[PDB]
Each structure stands twice: as C-alpha cells, then as structure tokens.
Amino acid sequence: MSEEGPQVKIREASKDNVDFILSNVDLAMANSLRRVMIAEIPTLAIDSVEVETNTTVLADEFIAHRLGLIPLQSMDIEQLEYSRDCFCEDHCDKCSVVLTLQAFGESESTTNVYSKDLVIVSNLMGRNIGHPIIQDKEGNGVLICKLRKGQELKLTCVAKKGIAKEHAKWGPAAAIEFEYDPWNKLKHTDYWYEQDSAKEWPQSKNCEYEDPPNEGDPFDYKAQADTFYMNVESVGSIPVDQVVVRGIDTLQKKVASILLALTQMDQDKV
Template identity: 50%
Template sequence: MDLFSPANKPEIRIQELTGERIRFILTNTDLSMANALRRIMISEVATIAIDMVQFDLNTSVLADEFIAHRLGLIPLDSTEADKIKYPRDCNCSGACKECSVELNLHVKCTEEDTTKDVTSKDLVSHDPRFTPITEGPKDAGILIAKLRKGQEIKVKCIAKKGVAKEHAKWSPCAAVAFEYDPFNKLRHTHYWIEEDEKKEWPQSKNANDDFPPLDDEIFDFTAKPNRFYFEIETIGSMKPEDIVMNAFKKLLEKISSIQMGLHSNDVPINGREPTRDVF
C-alpha cells in the first residue's frame, strides 16, 4: 500500500467523545504509523507538571520527598502547554516565566479534633492558565496530605513542561487502548482454546465495528492490518481530542525532521555531521 498516494489518505472516524475519553477508528494507514501515534500519545505529548518543590515548612507526618512526589503527580491544566518553553530551550538559568509556572501551597491545621486535608485545591498558581484541574465545584480536589492541629505545610512548587518519556507525571493519558483485527482474521495471534472458543473468548467491543469473517473466507496471508481501534482516556490535564491532535502534530514534526535529515544527509552542510536531534 502506498501510504503517500492521495487515494490512500488515512482516515479517522470518531465514535465517542466525552470530557475524559475519545474512541476512534484509524483506517488507511499501516501498523507502524498507528503504533507511533499510540506511543506519542503516551510518552511524548508535552504537559505541565510540578518538577521542583522547595520546602519552607513541613511539620506533617509525611516526608518531604514523599509530598514532593505526590505534588508532581497532580495533573495541571496543560491545554496551553505549547505556550510555554521547554526548560532546556529557555535562556534563563533556573526558572522563569517563559519556561515555568510557580505554584504555592500553604496550609496549616488549626482545627481541634479533626484532621485537615491538604488537596490540590490548596495549590495557588501564579499563572491562571496552568492550575490544578478540578471536576466542577463539588470536586474536593486530590488529597496530598492530612494535617492535625498545629501541623503546617508551606512549599513553593515550580511546574515545568515536559514529556512522559522523562517522567510518568508528564503523561497526559491514563491508558491507550489499541486494537486491530478483533476477529483475528490476519492470524497474528493464536487463541488458547480448551473447549469452546465462544465460551472462553468473549468478543471485543470493537468487534461490532469490524467485519466478521465469512464462513468460507479464504485466509489472505498477504493482508496487512489497516483498521485500528483507539480509545484514549485522559488524566485530566488535557482534553482527549487535544491529546490526539498534539500527538499528530508531534508525529508530523518527527516525520518532517526525518525527511529533512534524509535530504540533508545527501549533502552535508558545511561539511559538518547532520544534526541528529529528532525532536
């Protein structure tokens, strides 16, 4: 299949789109492209997450590094993550407004008898674009620690842009479901069956959208997968459709940089080694 012929343009059919998940079928492309999309969504879509935590005060029962770790995993709204620079691309020495967002957390428990919950709602962001996500006004926020009377946490957090390749906290999605060939027509796999396939192997939900094999269908050993069922669930920092779109953007960037690399490889510029940065 010629991927680049206009007749074979990849197609996406969105089947479901909610605030937290998107389901679509990707067709007319090959496996490597589909998997690349999956991989990028998991590990290379940039988001914002707390990266550095400076403790001014921590009298809670939890250790500093433990709280810092919890803070890092809190999803921040990253819809406008592309408006911010990667720290490595920034000219500043430490952290500046161009490449980071400062969030502050200062909670003290003064109540008698009950514990006070420190949640992501207590995080005060210096930039309204990048705040901890909440699900409506009723959302209690993500629990960070519990304080009893007299205990106090005061920290300064620096959130930075990054990708999940570096640390899982930058991943925008919880899980990416990916399937092709629900009927195993390509015979890539071999189902373990002891008695009855129907009883032991319930059908995948994607089977409804695929074409069941005909009774007399002849096995086509040259067939290639070209229908890919995706389902992406966001952790909240981005809308699911944005994850997909950003992933496509990233994919394009990658492909074009490869193309550039291939061309520039023919004639080395200034006799130097071509740049190997694929990002």
C-alpha cells in the same frame, strides 16, 4: 474527506474519552501514533519543591512526589519554553510557573490539604496554564496530605515543561485501548482452546462493529491489517481531541526534523 489517506470515524465522544476507528492506515503508523500519544506529548508539572516548614507526619520527599504527581493545566503549553533552552539562571515567567501552598491546623478535627489550595503567584501573561485540574463534584481536587491541629505546612513549587519519556508525571494519557481484527481472519494469533475455541474465548465488543463473521472460505493470504479501533483516555491536563492532534503534530515534527537533518548533512557533504 481529504485525499486517499487514513480515515477516521468517531463512535463515542466525551470530556475524558474518545472512541474512533482508524481505516486505510498501516499498523506501523497506528503503533507509532499510540506510542507518541502515550510518551511524547509535552505537558506541565511540578519539578522543583522548596520546603520552608513541614511539621506534618509525612516526609518531605513524600510530599514532593505527591505534588509532582498532581496534574496541571497545559492547554497553552506551546507558549512555554523549555528550561534548558531558556536564557535564565533558574526559572523565569516565560519558562516556568510558580505555585505556593500554605496549610495550617485550626480545627480540632483533621484538616485535609487538597490540590485546590495551590495558589499561582507568578505572572501567566494571559496563558491558560498552571491551574490544577479539579474533576470532582465537590471541587476539592486531589488530596495531598492530612494534618491535625498545630501542624503547619508551607512550601513553594515550580512547574516546568516536560514529556512523559523523561518522567511518568508528564504523561497526559492514562490508558489507550488498541485493537484490530476482532475475528481471527488474518491468523495473527493462535488460540488456546481446550475443547472449543469459540465457546472458551469471549467475543470482543468490536465484533459487531463491522467485520462480518468469517465463513468456511479459504484463508486469504493477501489481506493486511487496515482497520483499527482505538480509545484514548486523558488525565485531564489536555482534552482528548487535543491529545490526538498533538500526537499527530509531534510525529510529523519528528519526521520533519529527520528530513531536515538529512538535508543539512547532504549540504555539508557537498
């Protein structure tokens, strides 16, 4: 309850998904928030891989791509500086995290390599970043590659800050459900009925949640979309609530940067 701005209502919450309803908000703001949440949150991922010995049956580029696709902890990501903005040669402790992976084949059977085998050799300085995310009952994590007896894998990886816009490996959200107006009260779409619209088109699960069914009343031309049902799913690097908070913060920061640029250009003009 803060002013007459947008209102929220959380339906279901979990460790990986959050369900909420957006009210008293325009469609453009919700779409911008969704776009920011899917392609603007800064995260941490492996960007540079140095290979020493690779005797496995997989190519070096294959393993590099697989390692770059592995999610990493990014809770304290605001304390890490961008590599381009950092005063260093390649990477230091204040702008990157170094991880080393060593695998060897001892047993006769196949020896799998998991994301839990990654070891952080850099200094985190107390920051909660760089730890691989293991959401599994067995605790093994993401499978990287399989090697038999004799084969040896040894490489070093460097993790750097980035956003999903540059590469899809930096995206913290998997899929975001967006829906509004479960009934066709706004007439924003025309259905493809062959015999009847109601029977052929299944009813959405959000029909019961508010939005009473329409009657034979005249069409309302003064109504606008103001209620939105959203479900945000997180990969695991960032909590869902933190994902939404960081999306709102990023949108606010972008608008504030636009305002600052406008003020600077006004001052320069005068």
